[PDB]
């Protein structure tokens, strides 16, 4: 019943070597590629304990009694348990309570309590935290009270004396029911974002794996693009579909955006991947925004030139400017640097690129986009992110370069770990040799 | 430059025949399959007007002054405009206000105001509704007040005298800011769910197309599964990956769950698609949970047998019982039937299948799963869905059939339109011959 005949009772990440197990994860395909690349696998048990310990400590540090989580990404961080993640993002059927003493309860889908049993840090599997109109119609309120009473009892038993309960996001019916139980509702995101910002050693290992899988998937997509672009039928969607499939084949989870565009659709940026028929001798730019293997986000961006002619000089300049932008800004990264100083000292894009520059020069990343957000000086708000970088943070470093009314933009982005004494760029994906002007 | 040379200034759905347009939509692949299949296309303009008029009226009928929407699915309904939908589901950066006079405003991503300009019913494009920690850190509160003030002014101008504002779901900072402006916050979902429950003519056309694209994609997946299952390497993820790609190739959007499982991983149901290596002489069951072409959800389930042997006796019976379940239940459907009567009179599953039956026998569907939810008698809550079916509603009819401790389950489901006279099963996907006891 082993899924890997070559191993003993456990896989390299410590999970059961059992083809019929409930728990999912990276595929044999992914494991083989990582092994061949000499990547160390994370130990999931140790990873889960690390996250749980850190999240409990965050609650304690703030003087709160507990943290209640409805965002599926927070639930994933706390428990490492998935359940229809994407459905969950807009249907709040699920909840995790983590109390100050570390006691953790999940309210799951009624039918699927077994989905988090692989994590013994989840002490109970309940149901009935689904407080929205589709699931309960005109009787949300009655169950909202049942749920809030359950939270009151758990908090009485596991955080006695505490009235402060942090909540990331909760339906209005839930909010009221909790407030009626005497809780003072605190900002859960301030707790979760700052906790998730520091990755432990296994999370970094998992991220190295996800990044490799993502670059492999992207490589397949580039092969497909260069082979098929300009054949009169291949569309943006056709190319992008390769990324989707190659991600899923490696045990990835979803893609957050539609950020792949061709030709004049790259400017302005943020136009979505669609039916456009791609053309020979045009730019194609994209952003992975990918929730990949082990549920880790890999958020990188590349711009390709595909054609029999040379890219225009203005395209080469833009690309080199973009590359310079991220390499300069990345070099600012080391422990102890204050976020607003990254803002104040960032590489200056030429005037003609300023109007359409990206919404940030950097941002955190983990299970998805995460705190912090490092804004350009003209958008930065004083007092918003007054904190220093620390080892174990991971920041994506961004560049969007294009002119107002122009017919192309460049998007580049690399994913960068903060180390004990500087940074390590985790992204190894090539830059288009033609656009870089290296021919 | 036309994307479809065989056409004039517009595509068959009235959108601009322009390869370089901002607006996305179904691909030429999709339009080709639909033309061959004989399908009439929706007129998107009329569809958008129908939804808007209907939602405005819902606000008027309730005596509210406005409806404020942060759920990307409600934003999609109101405006038909997408923007990083999946990111949006857990990052509330976006909002739409619809006022009692039909005046409609969107707060979009700062960088991407152009994304909804194709819908002139969207009267303004603003920014600054992003009230969450990642985007604003310790300065959410200040923007929350700027935003709440903007909402107040709009409501003063477009719904004077109204202090009732329906909101679907909003971060706590936003809620407090709106209440500080004098609004009584009403349940937005009660408005959106009931409005979306009745599809206009163009939405029905869109859904027929989406249903065809989805069934085509599922066909590719079945082809793959039957050719490759049991080759010692093909995993659940490999098979499922085909659905992802084939959906995207036709202008689809995402998949809400991971509900495809093989062999003993189908019981209990709700185990997620993963690395499991598939086998000959086994069941593969799945649920599309698919957000497809035109952004329309197609939610159907099929169970397959793949092997050289024949299905066990208990498997064939389970399948017949399941098919009988949905066909009996479907017969209940016609305008005027009260939801709680669907519950009361539903097909009775054998004692052995009761413990693990589905969470509902039916539910609505449109842009995703939608009101109503039709529970089985033992879970139905009095006074939750006291409403009659009406023409234009669409319900999926569900069957989950398996024994406690069993080694397989059957999952079947069809998507059914409610007509003036009765029902029309939109789903034409074959049922597995061998499981049905045929050949
Ligand atoms: Fe990104
Ligand atoms: Fe990014
Ligand atoms: Fe489904
Ligand atoms: Fe369903």
Nearest chain A Cα distance for residue B95, angstroms: 14
Half-sphere exposure of B228 (CA within 13 A, CB side): 16
Residue with tokens 């033992």: B378
How many domains, in total, are found in chain A?
A: 2
Method: X-ray
d(Cα B219, Cα A60) in Å, to the nearest integer?
Answer: 53
DSSP annotation string for B302-363: EEEEESSS---HHHHHHHHHHHHHHHHHHTT-STT-BHHHHHHH-----GGGSTT--S-SEE
Burial code (b: 16+ CB inside 10 Å, e: under 16) for A123-157 equals: eebbbbbbbbbbbbbeebeebbbebbebbbebbee
CB B126 within 8 A of CB B165: no
Residues with Cβ within 8 Å of residue B417, at least 6 apart in sequence: B199, B204, B207, B392, B393, B394, B423, B424, B425, B426
Q: B262 and B120 in one domain?
A: no
Q: A250 and A158 in one domain?
A: no
Last residue of a domain, one of B144, B169, B199: B199
> Which one of A131, A137, A165, A288 makes the best mutation probe of the B interface by having the most chain B beta carbons within 10 Å?
A137
Nearest chain A Cα distance for residue B381, angstroms: 8
Sheet holding A66-69, edge to edge: A124-126, A104-107, A95-99, A66-69, A164-167, A184-187
Q: Residue A375's closest CA among A385, A360, A358, A389? A: A360
CB A296 within 8 A of CB A366: yes
Q: Residue B89's closest CA among A254, A269, A51, A214? A: A254
Q: B14 and B112 in one domain?
A: yes
Describe chain B by its helix, strand, coil percentages, rounded to 5.
40, 20, 45
Q: B229 and B83 in one domain?
A: no
- Taking phi first (over 0 means left), then psi (-120 to 50 degrees means alpha), and beta for anything else, what does residue B407 get? alpha
Residues with Cβ within 8 Å of residue B291, at least 6 apart in sequence: B252, B253, B254, B255, B256, B297, B367, B368
SS3 B101: coil
Phi, psi angle pair for B30, to nearest 5° = -70, -50
Q: Taking CB atoms and an 8 Å cut-off, how many pairs form between chains A and B?
A: 267
d(Cα B177, Cα B23) in Å, to the nearest integer?
Answer: 34
Instruction: Please state the separation of Cα A387 from the chain's center in Å.
Output: 21
Q: B186 and B93 in one domain?
A: yes
Last residue of a domain, one of B199, B231, B256: B199
**CA of residue A106 to ligand 4 center, whole Å:** 24
Chain B residue at shortest CA distance from A364: B134
CB A164 within 8 A of CB A67: no
Q: Can you give the CATH number for the domain in which B249 is found?
A: 3.90.230.10
Residue with tokens 């004989």: B38
Q: Cis bond leading into A268, ω under 30°? A: yes
Q: Is B182 exposed, middle or buried (0-12, 13-18, 19+ CB in 10 A)?
A: exposed
The resolution, in Å, is 2.1
Whether residues B27 and A237 touch (CB distance < 8 A) is answered with yes
CB B232 within 8 A of CB B206: no
Q: A248 and A195 in one domain?
A: no
Q: Can you give the CATH number for the domain in which B32 is found?
A: 3.40.350.10
Last residue of a domain, one of B184, B199, B214: B199
Q: Which two tokens stand for residue B267?
A: 């019981």
Instruction: Please state the separation of Cα A291 from the chain's center in Å.
Output: 6
Q: A408 and A271 in one domain?
A: yes
Handedness of CA A177, A182, A187, A191 (dihedral sign): negative
d(Cα B202, Cα B205) in Å, to the nearest integer?
Answer: 5
Q: Which chain A residues touch B238 with a CB distance below 8 Å? A: 27, 249
DSSP annotation string for A185-239: EEEHHHHHHHHHTS--HHHHHHHHHHHHHHHHHHHHHHHHHHHHTTSSS-BHHHH
Eight-class DSSP state of B435: T
Describe chain A by its helix, strand, coil percentages, rounded to 5.
40, 20, 45
DSSP annotation string for A43-57: -HHHHHHHHHHHHHH
Phi, psi angle pair for B81, to nearest 5° = -100, 125
Eight-class DSSP state of B388: B
d(Cα B56, Cα A293) in Å, to the nearest integer?
Answer: 43
Q: Which chain B residues touch A136 with a CB distance below 8 Å? A: 373, 381, 384
Whether residues A137 and B371 touch (CB distance < 8 A) is answered with yes
- Taking phi first (over 0 means left), then psi (-120 to 50 degrees means alpha), and beta for anything else, what does residue A437 get? left
d(Cα B324, Cα B318) in Å, to the nearest integer?
Answer: 10
Handedness of CA B16, B21, B25, B27 (dihedral sign): positive
Q: Residue A384's closest CA among A393, A396, A373? A: A373
Nearest chain B Cα distance for residue A87, angstroms: 5
Q: Which two tokens stand for residue B9?
A: 């200034």
CB A295 within 8 A of CB A424: no
Q: Residue B163's closest CA among B62, B66, B59? A: B66
d(Cα A12, Cα B275) in Å, to the nearest integer?
Answer: 14
SS3 B28: helix
Burial code (b: 16+ CB inside 10 Å, e: under 16) for A164-184 equals: bbbbbbbbbbbbebbeebebe
Q: What does DSSP say about strands A369-374 and A290-291: parallel, antiparallel, or unpaired?
A: unpaired
Chain A residue at shortest CA distance from B386: A138
d(Cα A194, Cα A313) in Å, to the nearest integer?
Answer: 43
Q: Which two tokens stand for residue B411?
A: 């999952």
**CA of residue B306 to ligand 2 center, whole Å:** 43
Within B55-137, strands assigned E span: 66-69, 95-99, 104-107, 124-126
A337-345 own/partner pairs: CB under 8 Å, 24+ apart: A337/A388, A337/A389, A338/A386, A338/A387, A338/A388, A338/A389, A339/A372, A339/A374, A339/A385, A339/A386, A339/A387, A339/A388, A339/A389, A340/A380, A340/A382, A340/A385, A340/A386, A342/A374, A343/A374, A343/A375, A343/A376, A343/A377, A343/A380, A344/A377
CB B173 within 8 A of CB A415: no
SS3 B45: helix
Q: Which two tokens stand for residue A261?
A: 């565009």
CB A413 within 8 A of CB A301: yes
d(Cα A94, Cα A74) in Å, to the nearest integer?
Answer: 11
Phi, psi angle pair for A262, to nearest 5° = -125, 145
Residues with Cβ within 8 Å of residue A197, at least 6 apart in sequence: A364, A366, A370, A371, A372, A390, A393
Handedness of CA B114, B120, B121, B125 (dihedral sign): positive
Enclosing H/E stretch for A291: strand A290-291
Q: Residue A315's closest CA among A435, A424, A419, A173? A: A435
DSSP annotation string for A324-393: HHHHHHHTT--TT-BHHHHHHH-----HHHHTT--S-SEEEESSSEEEEEE--TTT--TTSS--B--TT-
d(Cα A159, Cα A151) in Å, to the nearest integer?
Answer: 11
Q: Which chain B residues touch A133 with a CB distance below 8 Å? A: 187, 189-190, 193, 371
Q: A162 and A278 in one domain?
A: no
Handedness of CA B343, B348, B353, B354 (dihedral sign): positive
User: Quick one: angle between helices A172-180 and B172-180, nearest 10?
Assistant: 80
| C-alpha distance from residue A439 to each of A218, A231, A274, B299, B373 (Å) | 21, 24, 30, 49, 60
Q: A195 and A46 in one domain?
A: yes
CA end-to-end distance (rounded Å), chain A = 52
Q: B152 and B25 in one domain?
A: yes
Whether residues B235 and A370 touch (CB distance < 8 A) is answered with no
Q: Report chain B's C-alpha Rg in angstroms.
A: 23
Calculate the dihedral angle through the C-alpha atoms of B84, B24, A227, A27, rounding to the nearest 10 degrees: 40
Q: B153 and B273 in one domain?
A: no
Residue with tokens 């009624």: A110
Containing domain of residue A105, as a range?
1-199
d(Cα B107, Cα A131) in Å, to the nearest integer?
Answer: 26
Q: What does DSSP say about strands B66-69 and B164-167: parallel, antiparallel, or unpaired?
A: parallel
Q: Which chain A residues touch B27 with a CB distance below 8 Å? A: 235, 237-238, 274-275
Query: What count of residues does chain A have?
Result: 439
Query: What count of residues does chain B have?
Result: 439
d(Cα A200, Cα A337) in Å, to the nearest integer?
Answer: 20
DSSP annotation string for B362-387: EEEESSSEEEEEE--TTT--TTSS--
Q: A368 and A254 in one domain?
A: yes
Q: Residue B259's closest CA among B361, B400, B396? A: B400
Q: Is A433 exposed, middle or buried (0-12, 13-18, 19+ CB in 10 A)?
A: exposed
Q: Which two tokens stand for residue A318?
A: 């833009």
CB B65 within 8 A of CB B234: no
Q: Residue A270's closest CA among B137, B135, B117? A: B117
Enclosing H/E stretch for B53: helix B44-62
Q: What does DSSP say about strands A301-306 and A282-287: parallel, antiparallel, or unpaired?
A: antiparallel
């Amino acid at each position: 019943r082993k899924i890997d005949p070559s191993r003993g009772a456990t896989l390299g990440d410590g999970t059961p070597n059992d083809n019929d197990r409930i728990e999912i994860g990276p595929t044999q395909l992914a494991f083989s590629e990582w092994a061949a690349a000499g990547l160390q696998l994370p130990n999931l048990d140790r990873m889960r304990e690390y996250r749980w310990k850190r999240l409990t400590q965050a609650i304690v540090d703030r003087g709160y009694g507990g943290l209640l989580m409805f965002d599926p990404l927070n639930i994933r961080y706390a428990t490492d348990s998935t359940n229809m993640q994407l459905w969950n993002t807009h249907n709040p059927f699920r909840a995790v309570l983590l109390c100050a003493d570390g006691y953790m309860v999940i309210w799951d889908y009624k039918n699927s309590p077994f989905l988090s049993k692989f994590n013994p840090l989840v002490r109970e599997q309940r149901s009935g935290a689904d407080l929205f109109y589709f699931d309960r119609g005109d009787k949300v309120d009655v169950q909202a009270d049942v749920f809030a009473n359950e939270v009151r009892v758990l908090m009485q038993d596991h955080a006695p004396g505490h009235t402060r309960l942090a909540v990331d996001k909760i339906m209005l019916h839930g909010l009221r029911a909790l407030e009626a139980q005497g809780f003072e509702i605190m900002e859960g995101e301030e707790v979760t974002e700052k906790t998730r910002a520091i990755k432990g050693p296994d999370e970094i290992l998992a991220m190295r794996c996800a990044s490799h899988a993502c670059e492999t998937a992207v490589a397949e997509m580039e092969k497909f693009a260069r082979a098929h672009v300009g054949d009169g039928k291949t569309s943006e969607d056709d190319i992008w579909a390769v990324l989707h499939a190659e991600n899923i084949k490696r045990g990835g989870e979803w893609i957050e955006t539609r950020l792949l565009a061709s030709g004049p659709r790259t400017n302005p940026w943020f136009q979505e991947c669609g039916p456009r028929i791609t053309q020979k001798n045009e730019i194609i730019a994209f952003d992975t925004d990918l929730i990949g293997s082990y549920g880790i986000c890999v958020d990188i961006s590349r711009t390709w030139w595909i054609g029999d002619q040379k890219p225009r000089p203005d395209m080469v300049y833009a690309m080199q400017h973009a590359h310079e932008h991220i390499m300069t800004n990345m070099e600012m990264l080391k422990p102890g640097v204050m976020i607003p100083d990254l803002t104040a000292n960032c590489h200056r894009l030429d005037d003609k690129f300023q109007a359409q520059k990206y919404g940030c020069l950097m941002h955190g990343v983990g299970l998805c986009d995460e705190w912090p957000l490092v804004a350009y000086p003209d958008k930065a708000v004083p007092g918003s992110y007054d904190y220093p970088l620390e080892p174990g943070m991971v920041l994506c470093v961004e560049a969007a370069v294009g002119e107002v009314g122009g017919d192309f933009s460049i998007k580049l982005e690399d994913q960068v770990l903060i180390t004990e004494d500087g940074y390590e760029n985790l992204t190894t994906y090539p830059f288009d040799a033609a656009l870089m002007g290296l021919a």
